[PDB]
Amino acid sequence: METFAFQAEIAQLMSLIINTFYSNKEIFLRELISNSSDALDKIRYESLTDPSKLDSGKELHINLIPNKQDRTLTIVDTGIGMTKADLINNLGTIAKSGTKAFMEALQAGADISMIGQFGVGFYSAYLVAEKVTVITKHNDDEQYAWESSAGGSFTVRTDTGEPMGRGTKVILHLKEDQTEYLEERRIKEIVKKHSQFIGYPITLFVE
Numbered sequence: 001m002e003t004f005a006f007q008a009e010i011a012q013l014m015s016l017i018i019n020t021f022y023s024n025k026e027i028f029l030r031e032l033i034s035n036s037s038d039a040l041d042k043i044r045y046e047s048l049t050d051p052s053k054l055d056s057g058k059e060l061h062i063n064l065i066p067n068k069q070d071r072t073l074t075i076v077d078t079g080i081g082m083t084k085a086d087l088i089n090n091l092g093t094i095a096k097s098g099t100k101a102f103m104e105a106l107q108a109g110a111d112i113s114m115i116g117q118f119g120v121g122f123y124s125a126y127l128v129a130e131k132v133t134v135i136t137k138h139n140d141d142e143q144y145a146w147e148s149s150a151g152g153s154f155t156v157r158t159d160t161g162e163p164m165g166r167g168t169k170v171i172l173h174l175k176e177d178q179t180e181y182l183e184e185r186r187i188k189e190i191v192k193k194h195s196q197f198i199g200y201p202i203t204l205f206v207e
């Protein structure tokens with residue numbers, strides 16, 4: 001397991017998300033489902049020129065998996081996934097420019113719910129999670145696990161878990177006071193409100 005330091009910009013954004021008082025937290029699901037949808041679009045478009053791109057799995061879907069025992073909400077997609085380079089360097093670049101843009105928009109009057117317009121909606125996960133674990137598999141790399149509980153650092157290591165084929169799993173280790181997002185009625189309510197038109201089947205698992 002390797003440990004990396006977040007750059008100043010993104011670290012500050014993560015702290016604002018965790019410290020700022022904001023009641024409309026439910027938007028985190030909309031943002032994560034949107035990112036899954038985008039990743040699914042990417043692998044699908046690539047498969048149009050190179051069909052073998054789907055040898056690692058032809059199904060294009062999104063699964064929402066709540067687990068009360070572990071107090072986690074997992075979003076799983078069979079999208080393009082992320083390579084090690086994406087996890088450590090590429091997305092670090094996007095996180096910096098996106099954070100800078102978003103922070104300047106906030107001082108103007110932009111709301112936290114507009115975070116997705118700046119390419120850093122992923123971080124809205126910290127509105128409800130104390131820790132986020134990302135398990136991902138890209139065709140050009142091996143399966144990796146990225147993880148961070150804020151505090152200025154994150155980790156990356158090869159994942160020895162169940163082989164995914166291709167895609168991304170975003171595991172949200174929910175804060176003690178945010179367990180409503182593990183309730184079937186609550187999740188269904190949110191999906192219908194913000195993601196009813198996503199072009200991929202969204203299956204809400206139950207327990």
Ligand SMILES: O=C(N[C@@H]1c2ccccc2-c2c(-c3nc4ccncc4[nH]3)cccc21)c1ccnc2[nH]ccc12
Binds near residue numbers: 039089093095146
């Ligand atoms: O939302 C997605 N991805 C995010 C992301 C988005 C924007 C900026 C950084 C990061 C990041 C980082 C990340 N943030 C950093 C900040 C600084 N340095 C390295 C960094 N890596 C680490 C893991 C995951 C992610 C995503 C991509 C493809 N399909 C997906 N399906 C479901 C999510 C998903």
